[model samples]
Target: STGSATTTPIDSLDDAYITPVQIGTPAQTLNLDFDTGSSDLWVFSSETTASEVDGQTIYTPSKSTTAKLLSGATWSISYGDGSSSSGDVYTDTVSVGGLTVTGQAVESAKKVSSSFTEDSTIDGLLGLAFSTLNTVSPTQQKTFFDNAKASLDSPVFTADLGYHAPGTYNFGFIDTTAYTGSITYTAVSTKQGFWEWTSTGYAVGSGTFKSTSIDGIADTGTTLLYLPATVVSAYWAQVSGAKSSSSVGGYVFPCSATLPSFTFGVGSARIVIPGDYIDFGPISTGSSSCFGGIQSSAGIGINIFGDVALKAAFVVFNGATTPTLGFASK
Candidate 1:
């Protein structure tokens, strides 16, 4: 079996991607952020505090006859950005695109951070990371991907992220037409419950490809690309009037500057991120300075290849016996 779904970017900045998910009986459609960085299928529901609820949709388990409370089960998660959510759990029929799973764990958020309340587009998050990272206590439930793996033709899912455009998420099989060139496969480490891989090297603009082992995770949840300070500095240095500003909280440069492209090696293949992509956007509305999409990962500890990089290519999160990641130009 296979499933395909359209993922659309939310808001003008393409802050996040949202995919429609069918939860509970009779189907309550919720636009959820398909996050690859976390492993807990949580939703804003009737259980959530009234004060925290704003314009977002809420899932009401009482309306679904199939909804079953997972007694004694609870979950709590905190993201890198300091936003968090905690709640109880339920099991119900869940579906994504044409794929369906019965008795899937559905966490109902009782409390949510201010950031989540402010972002009205996302009703919740559907975690695609390994189930081992699930925050559920007493019983760690499998992700929707994992639950449907055995039924799929192949144990794989692909993320085709777009820059302020609509993309797709394909399960069970790869869509050949989504990419331009041959895919370069690399080993993946699931020990940390992420689609972690080591990039071969990198190059700034048209410079030489520096051979180095750069370990990072392909996180669809995050909004920016984070690399080593050395790599980040090199890329920014090529742009005139670019500097790290504490007030801006990242590398900012003159909006008129010609930003250089960034290239990263995947095996023998090199994927080039267009120059315009690096110029993320203005630091502030109507500001002359623009913030860079690529930032230093020194404080983050782990390098993250987030939406900024993911948007430039088609990515395969292969979950076969021996996990692997495949990257292709699109």
Candidate 2:
């Protein structure tokens, strides 16, 4: 294969994006969340309790001719939001788009926290983060991207996420048609096992740009843009009705308020997040209050350029030497 594939956003996505992946012989396909936040490819399987199964199509390794168990090897993962899963490991042929990787570690969940059981659409996650972060105990595992890099023309992947409409995630090559203007590049620091980088500064609306040097990661699994508390307060100060609401767990504003565009600087790149993109869904059904998409990164350790900020710009998670991130407006 060309080591290239395009992933469309899941049709039922209210937050996380997903793509179809075929595993094992004869190809058992499932929808998986392509996450860059962590490295572990796990799935709902025949081992899960019937009640925990819900509506997902389970992956039965026993049915695959090449599936082989790695004795006693297991994995357990807990997401930022407290969602988690745990299971044993299997080595099998995994394929995405047209690219294929042999002997990829596939975690088959025998136990899942309530979060996994409740989410019926997603059968698993495809971690694109650095291989070091993978959770298989006693033996670290390579991510699908890492395993496929040798066969790829270029060790790079691009994420182009759309709001309600379907967008794509491309592997091995960058498709110029997915974005416009020039691609602004920034040096990446992956010490944290994430696509971490420093922002030159940021501003709200047409206000004076403040040089609040911030470090953050580009996380596709997250739904909102998280920045420093002070920065979030500054942005909300401009909105007449905006205020921090403990009840809602974040800042909110009148649905009719004219929101300011949030702009963050990356080296010489000034990627702007539109006001509409900053307005998260309404606080309640038929209510005039809407939650702000940008929030304080109080306990999360660092800022995150989640789907809210990412969808505003086309992003390239380049794995080339001196790995870097490139952004362009759509």
Candidate 3:
């Protein structure tokens, strides 16, 4: 069966997209970050240490009759951002939107990093990447999408991330009305367990499109769009006051600067990111300098089409045997 859920940005900066997921027998709803860069459905739960429980909701396995401990199975996952979570596993009834999957692995966190505790809006993470990346030991588990694919009309899921408004994450089938025009499809390399693809090229504002192939992952978990240093520099150069600041930790500019739009090609289709989205937000409460939404991926090794880029278009993560990614304007 197909399922659809609303994904909302946690803050004004559109830092992360979170969707409500129902787990256990009675259905405990938690706002989980649907990360396409990782594979593990972990939650802050009764097993988590109180020190990391701050204001987040905790899942209680004992309260659910359908919950069964996955004996001897433990898992630990660390993200590129350094935040991490380690946990024991359980198999239970998990549901997203209206789609249900019995015996879905629901990881219960035993410990979490400080960053996760500070971000109270996120209760956990539901990984949508290939299940091959699952951290569970003794026996690896499948991602929710992987487990539910058989029941879906199609083995695909879509992400429509919004800037300040709520977007959608639909499972199984594509919402033809959700996007406009024709979708540009590209082969996805899941060997690395990410929705990784090669972008055709890019353009800065009204400049000509650069003929280049940029390899990047479609990561909803990442906050900013990170490109090659040359590409990033080209875009920032158009802004009069833009500069890469050491203290600011990234490229920042005067809050009033007329930022230029960024456009990236998906095959022959071009997705334009409005300059306003690149304005990001102010460095501080009343600061005159604002951080840029696009940054250099120099040290990161690979380009990352994070939320900043994903928000610019509708994205389809096809889970077919021969997986592919589809980009379309919305």
Candidate 4:
């Protein structure tokens, strides 16, 4: 449930954002990003000139009397968002919440772009998504979960978005209260850290519109729920009074009443996302009507069930065990 340490890969260079961790006595903090998309833990260093370290949070290792850099190694990562950074390797004590992990591998990037420089408040990203997107070295390095598994009591990680609030991301504990029952487990493929599954079908309101006949991968790293255009259109059509609008990106819908609830089945598990999730924001410039939940990616080839879908369940990627994904109620 909550305190689980599931492993995934670090594939994206942008996946290597920074996170806040405790350094030493008196509780000094350091910048770090734990990326499942990449295995490497990198940070910015004092040697990295401020001009080159725009948008990124640089860690002053010199400030940490106990911190030490991983000499003789260099690290550089580029994200799908067209953002990139490069720096040397280092090792130091890292802590999240109250858990302290020592000797954690880290990277210190020097050169970065404006995308990173503008966000001064963001320390870095702590990637806990799939490992297939990991950018870590040895190509098989264990992430924070691999290193901290023994310390966790329940071995579950739960993420809860605080309703428009920043939300809470917790590790080493599962919140069973959020779910109805025990979680269903699915096998994971070792080739890459991605979670694979055969979606049974999709449902709208009380009707099971489609059959159990689609297969694809589920990813937490992706932000949107990507599906085939045909499937997406069909599902939305089932809405009592659903209609497509061009004023907003094509996916948006315009309706006056509360939309019907839609649910999709993966194996025996049924996942329900509210109609509001489909129509996230306002469609017209000043109109109050919103859009639909399902969007069209048509020929994208890969259907990525991103955070929108993931937030509904407690997903665990057990790469260390049998390479499996356990989906439980949130």
> What TM-score, computed on C-alpha atoms, does each candidate reach?
0.98, 0.95, 0.99, 0.74
Query: Residues 186-227, candidate 1, lDDT per residue (tens digit)?
Result: 999999999999999899999999999999999999998999
Whole-model lDDT, model 1: 0.93
- Tens-place lDDT per residue, model 2, 98-217, is 788999999999888887788788898999888888999989899998898878888888888887666787878888888888898898888989999888889899987887688999
Clashing pairs in 1: none
Give the alpha-carbon lDDT of every model. Answer: 0.93, 0.86, 0.94, 0.56
TM-score of 2: 0.95
Please give the ranking of all candidate structures by lDDT, highest first, separated by commas: 3, 1, 2, 4
Ten contiguous residues with the weakest lDDT in model 4: 7-16
The TM-score, computed over Cα atoms with residue i paired to residue i, of candidate 1 is 0.98
Model 1 error, position 142 (Å):
0.9
Better of 1 and 2 by TM-score: 1
* Candidate 4, superposed: residue stretches over 4 Å from native: 1-20, 23-57, 118-121, 129-141, 154-156, 166-168, 213-218, 238-250, 255-260, 282-293, 297-301
Can you write out model 4's per-residue Cα lDDT over 1-330, one digit (the tens) per residue? 123222222222112223456653344565544433444454545666677555544577767766775666665667544776666655666667666666665566665656656555444444454434545443333355556666776554554432222334457665566567777776555454456666677776677657755655665445456677777777777665566566555565455656666676656887776655555555655765666556665555666666556656656555445555666655
Per-residue lDDT of candidate 3, residues 1-330 (tens digit): 899999999988888888999999798999999999999999999999998899998899999999999999999999998999998999999999999999999999999999999999999999999999999998999999999999999999999998899999999889999989989999899878899999999999999999899999999899999999999999999998899998888999999888889999999889999998887778999999999999999888889999989988999999999999999988
Model 1: lowest-lDDT 10 consecutive positions: 275-284
